[PDB]
Amino acid sequence: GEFESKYFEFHGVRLPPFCRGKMEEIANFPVRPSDVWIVTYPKSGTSLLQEVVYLVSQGEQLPVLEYPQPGLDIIKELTSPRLIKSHLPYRFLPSDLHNGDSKVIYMARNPKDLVVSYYQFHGTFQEFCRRFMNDKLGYGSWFEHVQEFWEHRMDSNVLFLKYEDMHRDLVTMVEQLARFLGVSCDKAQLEALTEHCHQLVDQCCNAEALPVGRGRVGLWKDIFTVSMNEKFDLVYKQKMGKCDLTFDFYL
């Protein structure tokens, strides 16, 4: 696990090696009330939802807190309002966020598309999927990462979003974000801002009215074999447990 430093094992969670020696500094990271924290499972292919949030907050570019670059020292001195990305589980986030400070948006995605995206990000797909099912990837069990943010979705500084809802209902979503983030609009400004989010999304879309590539919903169906999928579903039901979280696996 930590053999040859491949991973850094922290309180039962396998983290990338670059997380070693800074979990105390992140726990203590001073959060500003005007910060916007975007959390995603790694390589989950939600960039487009990220662009929409960025666009909303104003009615390679975004730093990751725990990454080698730009580093925590640069992130401390960034001018407000800061847009800060992380892949850490809720529990490993700055302790200020656990007390209700600032605003954390978690972007979930159904786990079948997410494994394809992760695998296609730039190894058989099948070993990768197996490593995913056996909780072997950096940042830990996906089932744990998602269920912890779902459990906190009613918290006042937490908005749990699902990637697929951005395609089924962008309108609800954009306003949900506007209100969460205290971006105050009259009617017309909300209609306009929504139409900008729409145009920005639609510009990646094809005849499915869905993005082409890793951000496509139902992508997994073209990749998973029948047995792979039967093995997945079985793991998924077993690891999800009593959790009442559901996804759209296609649109």
Residue numbers in the entry: 13 to 71, 84 to 146, 156 to 284
Paper text:
SULT4A1 is one of the hSULTs that is most divergent in sequence, and examination of the binding pocket revealed two significant differences that are predicted to affect PAP binding. First, a Trp in α3 that is conserved in all other hSULTs and stacks with the adenine ring of PAPS (Trp53 in SULT1A1) is replaced with a Leu in SULT4A1. Second, the magenta PAP binding loop is much shorter in SULT4A1 than in the other hSULTs, and lacks the conserved Lys residue that separates the key PAPS binding residues Arg258 and Gly260 (SULT1A1 numbering), which results in these residues being out of register. Taken together, SULT4A1 has a slightly smaller PAPS binding pocket that is predicted to be unable to accommodate the cofactor. Interestingly, some residual electron density was observed in the PAP binding pocket of recombinant SULT4A1. Presumably this derives from a bound small molecule that was co-crystallized, although we were not able to identify it either by modelling atoms into the electron density or using mass spectrometry. However, PAP when added at concentrations as high as 90 mM did not stabilize SULT4A1. Significantly, this protein, which is expressed primarily in the brain, binds to 2-hydroxylestradiol, thyroid hormone, T4 (3,3′,5,5′-tetraiodo-L-thyronine), and the catecholamines norepinephrine, epinephrine, and isoprenaline (but not dopamine), suggesting that SULT4A1 may modulate the bioactivity of these compounds via a mechanism distinct from sulfonation. SULT4A1 is inactive as an enzyme in our experiments, likely due to its inability to bind PAPS or other sulfonate donors. This orphan SULT likely has an important function in the brain, nevertheless, because it is highly conserved and binds well to the neurotransmitters epinephrine and norepinephrine.
